[PDB]
Amino acid sequence: SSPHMDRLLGDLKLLAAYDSAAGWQEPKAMESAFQSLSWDDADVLKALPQYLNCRGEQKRRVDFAYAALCPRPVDEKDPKQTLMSLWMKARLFSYDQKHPFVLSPFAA
Amino acid sequence: SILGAEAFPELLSKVPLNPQMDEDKHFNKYKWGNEPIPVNRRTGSRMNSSIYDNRNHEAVRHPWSTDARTFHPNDNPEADRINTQYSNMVSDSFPEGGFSDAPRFSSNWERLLAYHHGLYSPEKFNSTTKTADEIRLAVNDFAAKVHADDPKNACKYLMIEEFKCLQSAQARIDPQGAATKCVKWFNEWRQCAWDQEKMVKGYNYIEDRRARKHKPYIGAPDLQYS
Amino acid sequence: ARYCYRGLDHPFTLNEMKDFLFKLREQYLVNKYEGIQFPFVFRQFNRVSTPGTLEVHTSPALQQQPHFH
Amino acid sequence: ARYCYRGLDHPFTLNEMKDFLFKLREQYLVNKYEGIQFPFVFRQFNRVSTPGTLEVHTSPALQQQPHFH
Amino acid sequence: QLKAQIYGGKAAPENVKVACRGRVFEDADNVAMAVRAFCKRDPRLLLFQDNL
Amino acid sequence: SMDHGMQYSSIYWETSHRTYLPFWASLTQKFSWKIMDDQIRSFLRLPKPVTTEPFVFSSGSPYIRRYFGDADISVPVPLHAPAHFAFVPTGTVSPWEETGMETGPQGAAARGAAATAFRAVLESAWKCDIDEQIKEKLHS
Amino acid sequence: AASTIPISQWPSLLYAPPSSPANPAVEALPEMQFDDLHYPRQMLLCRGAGYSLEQCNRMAQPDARVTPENPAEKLLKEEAVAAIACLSQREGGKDEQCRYYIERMYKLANKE
Amino acid sequence: AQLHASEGFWDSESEQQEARLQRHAEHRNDLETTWEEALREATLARNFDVLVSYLNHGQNGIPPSVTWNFNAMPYGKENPDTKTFPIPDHEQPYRAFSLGFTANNLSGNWGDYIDRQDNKNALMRPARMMFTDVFIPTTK
Amino acid sequence: SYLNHGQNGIPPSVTWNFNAMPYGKENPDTKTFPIPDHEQPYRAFSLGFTANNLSGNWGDYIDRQDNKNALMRPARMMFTDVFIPTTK
Amino acid sequence: ASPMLFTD
Ligand SMILES: CCCCCCCCCCCCCCCCCC(=O)OC[C@H](COP(=O)([O-])OCC(O)COP(=O)([O-])OC[C@@H](COC(=O)CCCCCCCCCCCCCCCCC)OC(=O)CCCCCCCCCCCCCCCCC)OC(=O)CCCCCCCCCCCCCCCCC
Ligand SMILES: CCCCCCCCCCCCCCCCCC(=O)OC[C@H](COP(=O)([O-])OCC(O)COP(=O)([O-])OC[C@@H](COC(=O)CCCCCCCCCCCCCCCCC)OC(=O)CCCCCCCCCCCCCCCCC)OC(=O)CCCCCCCCCCCCCCCCC
Ligand SMILES: CCCCCCCCCCCCCCCCCC(=O)OC[C@H](COP(=O)([O-])OCC(O)COP(=O)([O-])OC[C@@H](COC(=O)CCCCCCCCCCCCCCCCC)OC(=O)CCCCCCCCCCCCCCCCC)OC(=O)CCCCCCCCCCCCCCCCC
Ligand SMILES: CCCCCCCCCCCCO[C@@H]1O[C@H](CO)[C@@H](O[C@H]2O[C@H](CO)[C@@H](O)[C@H](O)[C@H]2O)[C@H](O)[C@H]1O
């Protein structure tokens, strides 16, 4: 009944778990985290190629939100990290194109 | 209508967010197990540190009532500290959730008076530790601002380093402890300032002739210095 | 010797600065309190002044601090 | 000697009671802390155990208490 | 001249600068006097990239 | 309870440590050539140091030397009453107040753009869910 | 083996962290940025120019001075899309079902 | 003696007061945290019964009203906090006697077991080593 | 009217003391860059058949330490030509 | 990079 919210919070928890398991040297845990990351979402899958070709204001909004949630730059060589980043960005892109973000504190 | 069905994949798939959760829920997906962070390192109160203080290893006294059980730093750590990231290192010197010495004021004028006398700042008392990402963001913004202020300045990276050390030492919550770490870089900046002023404004002095025993031994080399 | 004959504009590091201020403090205390001695300043002498009826008691036990568990 | 052979039902005054409890406390401390010595209990012995790298520092100055004027 | 001597009269990288004891040198500066000022009797120079 | 303290540590001399003092050391006494040099300089009219002049040219702001009974012992003292300046507006800050709890721009900015962005993202997701619920409610 | 890092060594730990199975771009860690002053500064400048609050909010735009984007998202586009398709079909790549695409990506990025 | 230590008999009044304050602070913090939680839950539910139900989420006995310690018991040969009625001379004990050409026990007073004092006087305390057949110095 | 019956300046916001300045030969709160060897000072040398200064370390002026080791600290009187004991 | 990350 709240799938978008639920999947968002789950994705964030799994990212945190991946980072913790990497720090603690735990391939089993971090692969479990990678596998449990909501890859079966049709909306995000459809929005992925749209995000990959978007440009301008929408892209800047989504980049701002992604840098808020995950400002660390992933290694350009690690495809698992790259893919989870892409997935999170596609999710945010879907949410934004349904209901755009309002990031300023000044608003009415 | 159940609450939060799709929101606990950590529970559905037995994924632990940390070794403490792994140990608690018995998922057993951490090969190296878990050494629990004890309570004296998970929480506690600010203490005095110097041996030249009479109330050393005693809790700091405030106008308000506060638990006097202190945060104990890790003085005898284990050899293998598998996670050597800042996340696991900061717990050896500060508690991540902040100290347990914060007030809840019954009135606004008490807050005012404490601030006015220098015994309260919310920056200091209602706050957690900063994460490595936050520290890096702050440092990089400060570095950008300093570079914009003046590129052709020699004390630039020294100012950036004292800022970096304060942020890493968590001066928001332990300012005296952090200043104790960062005053060396402040001193180096103080020196660089004069070295730059004397290079800009040409200041020099009449050097004396060479000493008779400048070399200790005749066969020794007298390495020339500017 | 470091400033005026070797050419160092910054002869003292932080350690040497602390040592200088430590010695300044010791001078101040020695001139302020007459007869001050080791535990407060590094100094020992034998011919000391005592009250005349010197009482000897045990120190109090170290203060119990609160602790977890 | 005062109770069972002289007939005093109340052999100890307040001073003697304090002395008895003082000695009881000293016994407790001596059995609790191994090697405790003079300033905490009236006891002195020479063959002591030291860490190996014994640092010597000055005591801090006595705590400034607030006072009128 | 020092930078060219190091890099063999070839194209050096971008924004390369020299430091001594944490103190950046200008490129139109005499190395001897700069060392005399910033690092007296510690001539250890370091070459770094100043992007910032 | 600090003055007139007792001997706390022992005093001793280790075996065969040297002393570097002869038997006439008590009759030995020190000497500096500085007084004689000053007299000779004054009598021969040799170059004086600039510390004899109270004005100080070693900075741009005015300094005057204060002497402690002798020209050899002086300190420079600045004369200006320096004016200071603040490119700051008044009344724009209340540090005693916790600002993360109050609702408003000042509160969000005492918090961060990261928290505000997170709040906006939650807002968008909630709006998606509530739009779905509205749709299914009103189709019935 | 992994010994304790004292507090004096933390500034070097932040910009030269130890090795992990999931490392960041150490060369780009000085380039990660997120301005908390962006919108306040924008509002201040516009209100000083003379605009109203509504005009400022309409003219406001989000910061471009944030952490740069991964170049892999533009260079390895098709490979990443194929990997995500494989994951969506095969339940996150359980029992090594997207190893083909992941290994192709790893080789392309690393080159021995 | 261990029983007395459980009751805080060997403690000092400062230590007793500090323990009392520690309990006070822990209890206060528990209470204020529970109040914050209760108010949050009752605000999202909009129900006063919730606040009421948080009144029994935490009662063994009570804290003690007064405390007694060992340092409150008086001591002293001359202290009148110990003197009710004079003790007769035929019931008071004698001090030991030593007198010879070589040594005595009348040139000084060592004190009691608690209230001790230096047998030697101020002028010869610096030279105590000279009034001894053997001397075993301190460790420092 | 009782609002003005009692304003010189304000109390200080922060304070600095001498014990916040770091000290230590090995303390890295004092180390910015390494000091060259030709600028570091030498320790005194004493070596003879009778006495030396290498069997122990007295420490610095602030951070002192016992020259003798643990087994002979109780017998310090035996390593002295003269001994002036404490007053107690 | 900065000159103070260098230690050797
Ligand atoms: C087994 C090995 C064999 C192989 C050998 C290998 C070695 C080869 C290398 C050579 C060794 C080098 C080693 C490294 C050296 C560094 C170490 C060092 O030097 O310092 C250490 C050591 C460390 O001391 P310190 O604590 O650091 O203090 C340092 C001071 O700077 C100095 O200390 P000080 O100044 O405090 O001490 C000086 C002392 C001594 O000073 C002197 O003696 C000065 C020299 C005078 C000598 C000539 C006078 C002789 C008079 C003899 C007559 C007596 C009567 C005759 C009786 C006969 C019957 C017995 O002063 C006094 O005691 C007070 C005397 C004051 C009066 C003296 C001046 C008047 C002289 C005339 C007398 C008149 C008196 C009238 C009274 C008034 C009446 C009105 O230095 C000394 O102690 C210096 C004195 C050492 C004396 C040693 C005593 C033994 C001497 C005999 C040596 C062997 C003899 C060989 C045969 C030849 C003789 C027959
Ligand atoms: C409210 C009112 C109250 C008022 C107050 C009232 C007072 C109370 C009521 C009074 C009522 C009235 C009662 C009367 C008064 C009571 C007095 C009392 O009780 O006394 C206690 C009182 C002590 O009481 P305390 O509580 O025990 O005090 C602590 C200790 O005394 C501390 O002891 P220390 O650690 O100091 O050590 C002392 C040491 C002291 O011991 C020594 O002095 C020994 C030194 C010997 C060195 C030379 C030995 C040569 C022989 C070698 C032997 C062969 C070699 C074998 C190797 C091993 C042996 C060396 O040990 C001894 O004392 C041993 C004593 C036993 C031996 C005595 C020897 C007597 C021989 C006499 C010979 C006569 C010859 C006549 C020739 C005439 C001329 C033609 O008495 C003293 O004062 C003690 C000192 C007494 C002096 C004895 C000196 C004997 C030395 C004889 C030398 C012979 C050589 C002659 C040379 C001349 C011919 C060429
Ligand atoms: C990173 C790499 C680093 C690596 C490390 C590298 C190292 C550095 C680079 C090295 C480069 C290579 C350089 C070479 C090595 C350098 C070595 C060096 O510099 O040395 C410094 C080093 C010490 O340096 P230091 O910093 O000053 O150390 C602290 C002081 O030394 C502490 O002093 P003290 O408190 O311990 O007191 C000691 C005392 C010690 O003084 C005594 O020992 C005196 C005892 C005398 C008692 C008997 C006297 C009888 C005469 C009575 C006179 C008439 C009576 C008058 C009354 C007053 C006089 C008693 O005073 C003296 O030392 C005075 C010395 C001056 C007198 C010397 C007398 C020489 C006469 C020789 C006679 C030859 C006869 C041959 C007959 C052959 C047989 C047929 O040397 C030593 O080790 C000191 C001890 C030296 C031994 C001298 C012993 C002489 C005793 C002669 C006895 C005669 C009796 C004969 C009987 C047999 C016939 C029957
Ligand atoms: C009653 C009769 C009185 C007779 C008086 C006799 C006067 C004798 C005065 C000679 C003084 C010479 O003093 C000495 O000379 C030499 C050169 O010669 C100087 O010069 C020497 O040292 C300085 C640096 O230290 C440099 O110049 C150089 O390294 C060296 O030549 C010394 O700095 C000086 O200390």
Automatic annotation (TrEMBL), chains C, D:
Residues 56-69 are annotated as: Disordered. It comes from the Eukaryota. This is Transmembrane protein. It comes from Toxoplasma gondii (strain ATCC 50853 / GT1). The chain holds residues 154 to 222 of 229 of the full protein.
UniProtKB/TrEMBL annotation, chain E:
Disulfide bonds join 20-39. It comes from the Eukaryota. This is Uncharacterized protein. It comes from Toxoplasma gondii (strain ATCC 50853 / GT1).
UniProtKB/TrEMBL annotation, chain G:
Disulfide bonds join 86-98. This is Uncharacterized protein. It comes from Toxoplasma gondii (strain ATCC 50853 / GT1). The lineage of its organism: Eukaryota, Sar, Alveolata, Apicomplexa, Conoidasida. The chain holds residues 115 to 226 of 252 of the full protein.
From TrEMBL, chain I:
It comes from the Eukaryota. This is Uncharacterized protein. The lineage of its organism: Eukaryota, Sar, Alveolata, Apicomplexa, Conoidasida. The chain holds residues 208 to 310 of 310 of the full protein.
